Amino acid sequence: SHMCDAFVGTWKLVSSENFDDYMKEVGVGFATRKVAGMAKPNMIISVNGDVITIKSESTFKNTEISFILGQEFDEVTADDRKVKSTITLDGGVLVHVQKWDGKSTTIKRKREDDKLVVECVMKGVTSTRVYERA
């Protein structure tokens, strides 16, 4: 299919802005915010047929999701929320919506130049996380 070719690979976090405020808006507690905010994760994206896998590896937590676009799944997030997730491709952007406890957050992953830019939005608060090839 080649749907996500330009996302595939191993990516390393190189910059972050407003992530603590995003985590506050999500409801993450103090200690997790502090430890999670230090992490410099590897994001590893691969595709096999229709199944996309995204791994996040860091000193804080190692997470993994596998999914088919448009098909809801269960996710336990790094901060231990139990959420219902749906990921779609919209105009070349991977759009990941998480629902839990009547709340919602959206994580967008986009290729921009040689970077993979991750925008995390909770209500009025956005955090931008910039990844480069590992």
Binding positions for a fatty acid: 129-131
Residue 48, H or E segment: strand 42-48
Long-range contacts of 39-43 (CB under 8 A, 24+ apart): 39/13, 40/12, 40/13, 41/12, 41/13, 42/10, 42/11, 42/12, 42/134, 43/10, 43/11, 43/12, 43/13, 43/116, 43/118, 43/131
Q: Is 4 in the site for ligand TLF (CB under 6 A)?
A: no
Number of residues that bind ligand TLF (CB under 6 A): 12
Q: For ligand TLF, which is the closer residue by CB, 13 or 45? A: 13
CB 90, min distance to ligand TLF, A: 17
Binding residues, by number, are 129-131
DSSP H helices in 1-134: 19-26, 30-38
In the shown chain, the binding pattern of residues 39 to 78 toward ligand TLF, with x for contact by CB under 6 A and - for none, equals --x-----------------------------------xx
Q: Is 118 in the site for ligand TLF (CB under 6 A)?
A: yes
Q: Is 98 in the site for ligand TLF (CB under 6 A)?
A: no
Query: Which residue ranges make up the site for ligand TLF (CB under 6 A)?
Result: 13, 23, 28, 32, 36, 41, 77-79, 107, 118, 129
